[PDB]
């Protein structure tokens, strides 16, 4: 029972689709009796595709064609990284129903691009929560946010500028994905900072923030 | 006899539409027919997915068929034929989705436990008052600190019609927590799922600190030079 | 232990709630509600229009302050769904907000150009 | 210095002074006064804290 | 919120912790009974933490 990889195919996206499984070149697919969201939280963690959103045990019309049902049973906690960290004891135990397949709609992961500037290390901030790129707001912006986003950018440390280059690097246009983002200084990236809900902003596009480092 | 439909509880929590009829052990039969037949006539195959485990327990099984298409949401005359040679009359049951029921959003009210109840210092009953929903089926789950509470902690009633309203229903959900949890100020959130809700789920939270206050202390600082808030 | 119930910086109302651990028995601990409201004596009715008349009546619907119309996420067994937190909603702004900078546009004439330049109604807000 | 008639000041009519200067951020700063703003002899504040015993999370 | 919506108020009687499942709940306004259409009483259901006690809400 070695799940090397669990690809997501037959779906609109790279990591939105049905769950497969790979062992010893045999591409196989997984049914499960207890197939919760935490299993998808594992599955879109070992692939590194965002947080897990939806986990449908949704059947389709029978002419799809499908691989057989994976031999072991996979029930675990969900806080772990890969499909090897939790046990898959009952090998050869196929107690799914007749013709069904699972489905995961985990998010595309957080790609963060500093746009509008001459270099990629200096520009207005733009983030990717959904498929649409969008800026973030400067409500209660702090130097902890600057050092967190520069740590995630992999581009050194902030210098805390005098706001003139940030106002000169562009107002931007589009949508504002984040407002009132608040980083504690220790988070690896911008998702793990406290913020208002994605896309719910009380600011216009004139308040798009820029981080210089 | 029973044929439990997928409600909005089974639709939303599990994301799997399972047609289920329960064949109680009236008499032991070898080839128990729990064949879930469509109005079209094709049968999505189910057989003994879980035993009934009734007090008699004489060859009783539950057949759950995953007709998970849009044909249930649109609607069809689905029939499981509980036809048996023992008691030779076929004790079948037919269930369909109820058609054209008007959709009104639930107004969800979270009632804190009574002051009379906390004086006993034994248990606190938090009431989730889901009322005003005209489609009958509703799913109510309690969470504390973002973790789903166990279903033995809370008990939710069947929806019954609201008295003054014509066809709108109401439901309760009584969460029985110990008094030392509620008096320390622990947030108990009522997650309720309904079709007529815009985001499909409403979360009311209650705790002692929000509650009903027993000492408002207001300070209307009328300052000339306020201008911007600080 | 003043948990911040609202921190509305547009009407300046701040509401904070605490359980005062007053007595030994755990019931008579008073749920205390601290409404702190700053009333701008000289701000106009429309803050963004500096020529608006002086705001005299300051009405604060405290239910409108305490509404939470940002949908939150909840974790179900099979899904993460956005969850509405109130039934109220489906803005006067007595005071300016510190984080928000408000600009008004004035007609500036020199030789009849009427170049409409934006001011800063709140200086040291977007500098 | 701006000289106006006395009944013009007592009927509201908010006068705005705007400046134009180099060191200013948007090059323009505006201040206003009227009868009710500049050094008034009356403060007609009518606070209405409605619905404070009603719902607040 | 119910009084804030200004169309309806629902006073809930929470009969809990009783062992035989035989409860009759009726409401009086000022000492005389209201009509049984105005109130609705749920059936006695098992209280889950207590072993055999029941509860009912009206
Ligand atoms: C408050 O004042 C602002 C600024 O004067 C008003 O905004 C302008 O309103 C006019 C008429 O509605 C529009 O033609 C302009 O395009 C607006 N400008 C801006 C920058 O928004 C606003 O309408 C006023 N609000 C109230 C309630 O009086
Ligand atoms: C309410 O009372 C507390 C004392 O417990 C005090 O510190 C606080 O300032 C009061 N609230 C306001 C708004 O003044
Ligand atoms: C004071 O405010 C009240 C609020 O309605 C208003 O009716 C009254 O005319 C005002 N009086 C003055 C002198 O501004
Ligand atoms: Ca904000
Ligand atoms: Ca801002």
| Inter-residue contact B176 to B124 (CB < 8 Å) | yes
Strands B35-37 and B79-81: antiparallel
Backbone CA torsion sign across B71, B74, B76, B80: positive
Q: To 5 degrees, how large is the angle CA C103–CA C107–CA C111?
A: 145
Resolution (angstroms) equals 3.4
B42 CB-contact burial (10 Å; exposed 0-12 / middle 13-18 / buried 19+):
exposed
Q: Which residue has the tokens 């327990």?
A: B57
- Distance in Å from the first CA to the final CA of chain B: 67
- Tally of CA atoms within 13 A in the half-sphere of C70 that contains its CB: 14
Q: Note whether E35 contacts B: Cβ–Cβ < 8 A.
A: no
Question: Does the beta carbon of C56 sit less than 6 angstroms from any atom of ligand 3?
Answer: yes
B43 CB-contact burial (10 Å; exposed 0-12 / middle 13-18 / buried 19+):
middle
DSSP annotation string for chain A: ----B--EESSSSSSEEEEEEEETTEEEE---SS--HHHHHHHHHHS--S---BEE-----GGG----B-SS-----S-SSSTTSS---STT---S-SS---EEEPPPP-EEEEEEEEETTEEEEEEESSSSEEEEB-TT--HHHHHHHHHHHTS-------SHHHHHT----S-EEESS-B--S--SSSTTSB-S-TT--SS-GGGB-EEE-
Strands A26-29 and B19-23: unpaired
The tokens for B171 are 């439901």
Atom 13 of ligand 2, residue of closest alpha carbon: C36
Strands C31-40 and B215-223: parallel
- Tally of CA atoms within 13 A in the half-sphere of A196 that contains its CB: 19
- Distance in Å from the first CA to the final CA of chain A: 47
Buried b (16+ CB within 10 A) or exposed e, C37-69: bbbbbbbbeebeebbeebbeebebbbbbbbbee
In angstroms, the CA D49 to CA E6 distance is 19
Strands A16-23 and A8-9: antiparallel
Buried b (16+ CB within 10 A) or exposed e, B55-65: eeeebbbbbbb
In angstroms, the CA B149 to CA B134 distance is 27
In angstroms, the CA C36 to CA C34 distance is 6
| Inter-residue contact B121 to B112 (CB < 8 Å) | no
Q: To 5 degrees, how large is the angle CA B191–CA B196–CA B197?
A: 40
Q: Which residue has the tokens 């902890």?
A: A144
Backbone CA torsion sign across B146, B148, B154, B158: positive
Rg (CA), chain C: 21
Q: Which residue has the tokens 């166990």?
A: B150
Helix (H, G, I), strand (E, B) or coil at C75: strand
D47–B220 C-beta distance less than 8 A? yes
In angstroms, the CA B199 to CA C79 distance is 13
The chains found to touch E (3+ Cβ pairs under 8 angstroms) are B, C, D
Q: Looking at beta carbons, which residues of chain C come within 8 Å of D37?
A: 42, 54
Residues 6+ apart with CB under 8 A from C1: C18, C19
Q: 10 Å Cβ neighbour count for A88?
A: 18
Partners of C15 in the β-ladder:
C6, C35
- Tally of CA atoms within 13 A in the half-sphere of C117 that contains its CB: 19
Q: Report which of A112, A209, A119, A213 is spatially closest to residue A158, judged by C-alpha positions.
A: A213
Strands A122-128 and A210-212: antiparallel
Q: Report which of B86, B106, B110 is spatially closest to residue B33, judged by C-alpha positions.
A: B86
Backbone CA torsion sign across B95, B96, B101, B105: positive
B198 CB-contact burial (10 Å; exposed 0-12 / middle 13-18 / buried 19+):
exposed
The tokens for B148 are 């789903």
C56, C57, C58, C59: residue to mutate for ligand 3 pocket, most atoms within 8 A of CB: C56
Identify which ligand lies nearest to the alpha carbon of C37: 2
Size of interface A-B (CB pairs under 8 A): 24
Phi, psi torsion values for B60, nearest 5 degrees: -120, 135
In angstroms, the CA B124 to CA B180 distance is 9
Helix (H, G, I), strand (E, B) or coil at C38: strand
Chain centre to alpha carbon of residue A111: 9
| Inter-residue contact C72 to C23 (CB < 8 Å) | no
In angstroms, the CA A104 to CA A16 distance is 6
The chains found to touch C (3+ Cβ pairs under 8 angstroms) are A, B, D, E
Question: Ligand 3 atom closest to Cα of D36?
Answer: 14
C80–A197 C-beta distance less than 8 A? no
DSSP annotation string for B89-134: S---EE--PPTT------EEEEEPPPHHHHTTTS-EEEEEEEEEE-
C105 CA to centre of ligand 1 in angstroms: 10
Distances (CA, A) of B116 to B113, B125, C19: 8, 11, 19
Strands C14-19 and C3-7: antiparallel
Mutate to test the interface with D, among C4, C7, C42, C48 (most CBs of D within 10 A): C42
Residues in chain C preceding a C-to-N separation beyond 2.5 angstroms (breaks): 90
Phi, psi torsion values for B142, nearest 5 degrees: -95, 140
Write the DSSP symbol of residue B157. P
In angstroms, the CA C30 to CA B115 distance is 12
C103–D20 C-beta distance less than 8 A? no
Residues 6+ apart with CB under 8 A from D21: D27, D29
Question: Ligand 2 atom closest to Cα of C35?
Answer: 13
Q: 10 Å Cβ neighbour count for B69?
A: 15
A208 CA to centre of ligand 4 in angstroms: 12
Question: Does the beta carbon of C59 sit less than 6 angstroms from any atom of ligand 3?
Answer: no
Helix (H, G, I), strand (E, B) or coil at D8: helix
In angstroms, the CA C104 to CA A69 distance is 66
Identify the experimental approach.
cryo-EM
Residues 6+ apart with CB under 8 A from B148: B141, B142, C75, C76, C77
Question: Does the beta carbon of C54 sit less than 6 angstroms from any atom of ligand 3?
Answer: no
The tokens for B162 are 């609201």
In angstroms, the CA B83 to CA B92 distance is 7
DSSP tally for chain B: helices H, then strands E: 4, 18
The tokens for C119 are 């001011």
Q: Which residue has the tokens 């429309």?
A: C46
Helix (H, G, I), strand (E, B) or coil at E25: coil
Q: Looking at beta carbons, which residues of chain A come within 8 Å of B44?
A: 98
DSSP annotation string for A117-168: EEETTEEEEEEESSSSEEEEB-TT--HHHHHHHHHHHTS-------SHHHHH
Phi, psi torsion values for A151, nearest 5 degrees: -65, -40
Helix (H, G, I), strand (E, B) or coil at D46: strand
C46, C55, C120: residue to mutate for ligand 1 pocket, most atoms within 8 A of CB: C46
A52 CA to centre of ligand 5 in angstroms: 31
In angstroms, the CA D15 to CA D17 distance is 7
Residues in chain B preceding a C-to-N separation beyond 2.5 angstroms (breaks): none
Phi, psi torsion values for A187, nearest 5 degrees: -75, 150
Cite the DSSP H helix spans in chain B: 8-13, 71-74, 115-118, 179-183
Backbone CA torsion sign across C20, C22, C26, C30: negative
Phi, psi torsion values for E47, nearest 5 degrees: -70, 120
Cite the DSSP H helix spans in C4-109: 62-65
C11 CA to centre of ligand 2 in angstroms: 19
Q: To 5 degrees, how large is the angle CA C2–CA A140–CA A189?
A: 100
Q: Note whether E1 contacts C: Cβ–Cβ < 8 A.
A: yes
Distances (CA, A) of B210 to B124, B143, B203, B213, C21: 16, 17, 15, 7, 15
Of C71, C77, C82, the CB nearest to A37: C77
A196 CA to centre of ligand 5 in angstroms: 14
């Amino acid at each position: 029972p070695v799940p090397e990889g669990v690809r997501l195919a037959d779906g609109p996206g790279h990591c939105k689709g049905r769950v497969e499984v790979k062992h010893q070149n045999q591409w196989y697919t997984v049914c499960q009796t207890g197939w919760s969201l935490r299993a998808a939280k594992v599955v879109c963690r070992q692939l590194g595709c965002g947080r897990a959103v939806l986990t449908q045990k949704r059947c389709n019309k029978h002419a799809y064609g499908r691989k057989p049902i994976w031999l072991s049973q996979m029930s675990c906690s969900g806080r772990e990284a890969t499909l090897q960290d939790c046990p898959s004891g009952p090998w050869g135990k196929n107690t799914c129903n007749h013709d069904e397949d699972t489905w995961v709609e985990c998010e595309d992961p957080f790609d963060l691009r500093l746009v509008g500037g001459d270099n990629l290390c200096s520009g207005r901030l733009e983030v990717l929560h959904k498929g649409v790129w969008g800026s973030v707001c400067d409500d209660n912006w702090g130097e902890k946010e600057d050092q967190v986003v520069c740590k995630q950018l992999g581009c050194g440390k902030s210098l805390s500028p005098s706001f003139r280059d940030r106002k000169c690097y562009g107002p931007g246009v589009g949508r504002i994905w984040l407002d009132n983002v608040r980083c504690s200084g220790e988070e690896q990236s911008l998702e793990q900072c406290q913020h208002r809900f994605w896309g719910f902003h009380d600011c216009t596009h004139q308040e798009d923030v820029a981080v210089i480092c | 006899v029973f044929a439990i439909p997928p409600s909005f509880a089974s639709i939303f929590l599990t994301k799997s539409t399972k047609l289920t009829c329960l064949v109680t052990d009236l008499t032991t039969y070898d080839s128990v027919t729990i064949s879930w037949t469509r109005q079209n006539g094709e049968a999505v195959k189910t057989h003994t997915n879980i035993s009934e485990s009734h007090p008699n327990a004489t060859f009783s099984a539950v057949g759950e068929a995953s007709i998970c298409e849009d044909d249930w949401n649109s609607g069809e005359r689905f029939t499981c034929t509980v036809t048996h040679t023992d008691l030779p009359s076929p004790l079948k049951q037919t269930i369909s989705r109820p058609k054209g029921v008007a959709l009104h959003r639930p107004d969800v009210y979270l009632l804190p436990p009574a002051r009379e109840q906390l004086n006993l210092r034994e248990s606190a009953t938090i009431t989730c008052l889901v009322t005003g929903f005209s489609p009958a089926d509703v799913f109510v789950q309690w969470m504390q600190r973002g973790q789903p509470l166990s279903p033995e902690k809370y008990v939710t009633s069947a929806p019954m019609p609201e008295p003054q309203a014509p066809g709108r229903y109401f439901a309760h959900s009584i969460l029985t927590v110990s008094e030392e949890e509620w008096n320390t100020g622990e947030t108990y959130t009522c997650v309720v799922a309904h079709e007529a809700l815009p985001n499909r789920v409403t979360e009311r939270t209650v705790d002692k600190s929000t509650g009903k206050p027993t000492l408002y202390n207001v300070s209307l600082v009328m300052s000339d030079t306020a201008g911007t808030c600080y | 232990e003043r948990i911040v119930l609202v921190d509305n910086k547009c009407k300046c109302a701040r509401i904070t709630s605490r359980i005062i651990r007053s007595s030994e028995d755990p019931n008579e601990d008073i749920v205390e509600r601290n409404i702190r409201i700053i009333v701008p004596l000289n701000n106009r009715e429309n803050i963004s229009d500096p020529t608006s008349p002086l705001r005299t009546r300051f009405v604060y619907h405290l239910s409108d302050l305490c509404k939470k119309c940002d949908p939150t996420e909840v974790e179900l067994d099979n899904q993460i769904v956005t969850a509405t937190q109130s039934n109220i909603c489906d803005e006067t702004c007595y005071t300016y907000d510190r984080n928000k900078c408000y600009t008004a546009v004035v007609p500036l004439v020199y030789g009849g150009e009427t170049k409409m330049v934006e001011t800063a109604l709140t200086p040291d807000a977007c500098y």
